[model samples]
Target chain A: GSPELQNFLTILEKEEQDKIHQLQKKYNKFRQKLEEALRES
Target chain B: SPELQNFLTILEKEEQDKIHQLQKKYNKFRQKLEEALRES
Candidate 1:
């Protein structure tokens, strides 16, 4: 599991994983919702 | 575990066939087109 793997969509293609920060930023809006739902349950 | 994996939700082979068929069909069509242009 990645550092941010607590999010539902955990697996990253290695090439893109280098830009984890950017990936998180791009996916943040969707991921925040996913995270919030998981945290609530 | 069975190693032979033949599972495809949508393995549409038509596009690859289209590319192949065009090469076969067009070669004949192109020959006719070229002959049409030649007049003595």
Candidate 2:
């Protein structure tokens, strides 16, 4: 069910991309679902 | 999702990833719950 990465997904807004990384690091352990999904990918 | 240390760089990437994941779950659940229809 994964959609092919759209160009929209490829290039992100500068601020948005930063938020993603921060969240990832912040939730690196807390957000298990997100962490697992990310690690799996 | 690719990880980059630069905070500003990841800002948008996280936004997109968040949106995508949200959409993925949203797309599947509606269909799944609809199928369950109280049998759940």
Candidate 3:
């Protein structure tokens, strides 16, 4: 891992990390839907 | 601009916290996900 990223994650608590993980999953799913819809149309 | 205070004035403290939290999660996973894709 890069030094900055390692330091950043090391500083955060677990619940905070989990919160972002959930939103990231949502954002990806949202993107996938947009791409799929565009392709289908 | 007279924007800094106005921006904060409209933003909720809790929501800002949520936004901050979400970006952290997104950044952390973004690195991992791309690395996995590259290796494969």
Q: What is the lDDT, from 0 to 100, of the residue A23 in candidate 1?
A: 43
Model 2 per-residue lDDT tens digits across residues A1-41: 22333343434344455655676676555444555555676
Best-fitting candidate, scored by TM-score: 3
- Go through the candidates in order and give each one's C-alpha lDDT: 0.43, 0.54, 0.61
Overall local distance difference test of candidate 3 = 0.61
Task: Evaluate every candidate with DockQ and list the scores.
Answer: 0.01, 0.04, 0.06
**Which portions of model 3 show Cα errors greater than 4 Å?**
A1-12, B1-18, B21-40
Model 2: how far is A24 from its true place, Å?
Answer: 17
lDDT of 2 by residue, B1-40 (tens): 3452344345556656786775566558656754665474
Residue-level lDDT of model 1, residues B1-40, one tens digit each, is: 1211221111224333544555566457656644764542
lDDT of 1 by residue, A1-41 (tens): 33443242233233234454454464555445545555575
Interface RMSD of each: 15.0, 9.8, 10.3
TM-score of candidate 1 versus the correct structure, residues matched by position: 0.30
Q: What is candidate 3's lDDT per residue for A1-41, written digit by digit as tens? A: 46665566566546566766676676656556655665576
TM-score of chain A of each: 0.32, 0.38, 0.62
RMSD to native, candidate 2: 15.2
Between candidates 2 and 3, the TM-score winner: 3
